[PDB]
Design a binder for this molecule. Structure first.
Ligand SMILES: Nc1cc(Cn2c(C(=O)O)c(-n3c(=O)[nH]c4cscc4c3=O)c3cc(C(F)(F)F)ccc32)ccn1
Length: 563
């Protein structure tokens, strides 16, 4: 069947759209080549529609069926709870898209009578009605990139009332089932330090390792109605409350398998027969589907001792080599099996014999040295996209701050420490906003974080070595330096000068600012301050941070204020 059918109505914006980076003094201090930075808009939506619209041909075999049964036997150990309305309302982001039924995200979080009444009625409708397709809105996503232009990605989501009901029925399932099924292969259970540890240990556990990343082109579009029903068959192995079992059954048939598409003007836009990017099950379902297809394909290809690391559609495979010619033919057989399963590649996969040459979740393992000179492995990436997005976020207030999420996840990197920490701490200190909570996302979930709490968060996610790394690899240094020339970012010597200045001001303020000065900026001086475990680090409640993926799932994980 076709992934989409279109009526001809356009994918429309709901307000004015900006595509060009503004010429602003604060963003210009970071990045001077503003014309290289752009944001996608609904103007390129038709280009994206063409790429995501195609017929799927799926052929399943015995390897696929055997893997499915093994996955279902693991899912059969799970007991999942139904969330109460209050618990589901607390998980709603403060700025989640308002309902078309006269209430918004603030009303949901406050348990307003109108919000609660509508949610109760949507819930009863899922219990009673197993067939009526649920309406979805289709919008073009606004994302920032550097030139060499990508068309806008498309987001498809149901009304706010439906989203709260999805959490009641499935929040506990999507949060616990993936690790029960995939074990150590489920990527979202790891902090960045645990992810590097798993990759390094897996690589070194093989007698002769071979690894590859597998990129599926337009993954959401490759997901069939059969894949979505198979995903439900896994969820159905859980012990569930009867209302949850009915709501999952109704959500699968009325929403997850497909449905009508409506634009921002209320016009009928088309029909979807593939994965919706903006539903609670998107990350869990994509992870399960990608793992199932890859595990079965590994057996069809005769790849030896395949260890997967899966995060939604992102897949990395580490296995036992059989020699270069054998591995090359086995990888082609893996690709042919994935294609039969309706997961064709974007870029054809390449066998790799060095762990540092593999790119997974846009990142690669690199090496630096700690204070004692000991080798430390860490995850880095090309800093182009993070710097272009940090420049945009400096010139325009955006709801989600990728710069903050990049500092958290990429804290040990030369670019996050020297550029991002230096730039944002300087601006925030000058605006007296170091203590102001800002939103960021970790594995798709939204968090409200104060920049002053960064040292203890970094210590927990990466260890104290994140504040002591030096002697970065020449390859890493060259990649950063070349990206700065390309974007017109001032050189690292300038960032070291700016860091010494903000560090002195942070130290002069005492308290939490001085902890930021001491730990975050120790790299900028020869006269190093002594770095001991931060007391607040052991008291940090990071439950929920690295449990599961929630991209498109409309999840908020920061504490709810009492009433
Ligand atoms: N492409 C992907 C990435 C992922 C998982 N994922 C995400 C994510 O946004 O979900 C990261 N991440 C965040 O969780 N918050 C963020 C805020 S701004 C940038 C990120 C970011 O990269 C992230 C960082 C790393 C590390 F390498 F750092 F370990 C590894 C995997 C990561 C799965 C599938 N495709």
């Amino acid at each position: 069947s076709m992934s989409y059918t279109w009526t001809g109505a356009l994918i429309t914006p709901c307000a004015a759209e900006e595509s060009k980076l503004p010429i602003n003094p604060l963003s210009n201090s970071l990045l001077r080549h503003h014309n290289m930075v752009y944001a996608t808009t609904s103007r390129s939506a038709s280009l994206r529609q063409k790429k995501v619209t195609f017929d799927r041909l799926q052929v399943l075999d015995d390897h696929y069926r055997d893997v499915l049964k093994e996955m279902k036997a693991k899912a059969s150990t799970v007991k999942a709870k139904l969330l109460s309305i209050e618990e589901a309302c607390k998980l709603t982001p403060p700025h989640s898209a308002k309902s078309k039924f006269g209430y918004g995200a603030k009303d949901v979080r406050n348990l307003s009578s109108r919000a609660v009444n509508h949610i109760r009625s949507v819930w009863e409708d899922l219990l009673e009605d197993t067939e009526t397709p649920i309406d979805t809105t289709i919008m073009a996503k606004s994302e920032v990139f550097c030139v060499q232009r990508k068309p806008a990605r498309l987001i498809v989501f149901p009304d706010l009332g439906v989203r709260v009901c999805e959490k009641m029925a499935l929040y506990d399932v999507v949060s616990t089932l993936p690790q029960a099924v995939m074990g150590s292969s489920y990527g979202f259970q790891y902090s960045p330090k645990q992810r590097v540890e798993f990759l390094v240990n897996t690589w070194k556990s093989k007698k002769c390792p071979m690894g590859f990343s597998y990129d599926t082109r337009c993954f959401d579009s490759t997901v069939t109605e059969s894949d979505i029903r198979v995903e439900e068959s896994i969820y159905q192995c859980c012990d569930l409350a009867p209302e949850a079992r009915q709501a999952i059954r109704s959500l699968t048939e009325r929403l997850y398998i497909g449905g009508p598409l409506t634009n921002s003007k209320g016009q009928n836009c088309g029909y979807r027969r593939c994965r919706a990017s903006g539903v609670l099950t998107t990350s869990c379902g994509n992870t399960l589907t990608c793992y199932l297809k890859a595990t079965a394909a590994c057996r069809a290809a005769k790849l030896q001792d395949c260890t997967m690391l899966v995060n939604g559609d992102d897949l990395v495979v580490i296995c036992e080599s059989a020699g270069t010619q054998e591995d090359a033919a086995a990888l082609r057989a893996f690709t042919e099996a994935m294609t039969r399963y309706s997961a064709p590649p974007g870029d054809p996969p390449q066998p790799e014999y060095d762990l540092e040459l593999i790119t997974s979740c846009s990142s690669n393992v690199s090496v630096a040295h700690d204070a004692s000179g000991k080798r430390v492995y860490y995850l880095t990436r090309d800093p182009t996209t993070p710097l272009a997005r940090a420049a945009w976020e400096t010139a325009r207030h955006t709801p989600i701050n990728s710069w903050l999420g990049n500092i958290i996840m990429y804290a040990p990197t030369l670019w996050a420490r020297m550029i991002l920490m230096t730039h944002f701490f300087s601006i925030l200190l000058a605006q007296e906003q170091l203590g102001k909570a800002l939103d960021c996302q970790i594995y798709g979930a939204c968090y409200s974080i104060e920049p002053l709490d960064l040292p203890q968060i970094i210590e927990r996610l990466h260890g104290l070595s994140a504040f002591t790394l030096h002697s970065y690899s020449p390859g890493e240094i060259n990649r950063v330096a070349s990206c700065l020339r390309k974007l017109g970012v001032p050189p690292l010597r300038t960032w070291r000068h700016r860091a010494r200045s903000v560090r002195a001001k942070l130290l002069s303020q005492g308290g939490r600012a001085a902890i930021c000065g001491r730990y975050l900026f120790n790299w900028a001086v020869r006269t190093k301050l002594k770095l001991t475990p931060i007391p607040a680090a052991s008291q940090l409640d990071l439950s929920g941070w690295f449990v599961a993926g929630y991209s498109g799932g409309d999840i908020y994980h920061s504490l709810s204020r009492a009433r």
